What we know:
The protein has 1 helix and no strands. By secondary structure, it is mainly α. It is flat, with a radius of gyration of 9 Å. The N and C termini lie far apart (31 Å). The structure holds zinc ion. This is NF-kappa-B essential modulator.
Amino acid sequence: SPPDFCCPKCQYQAPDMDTLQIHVMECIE
Ligand SMILES: [Zn+2]
């Protein structure tokens, strides 16, 4: 099961899908 909870900005590992989206939404300055 290829990990899909990875951020395309810093490869950050998210515990879920929602939190992950929130991370990327601001991961960009
Ligand atoms: Zn990120």
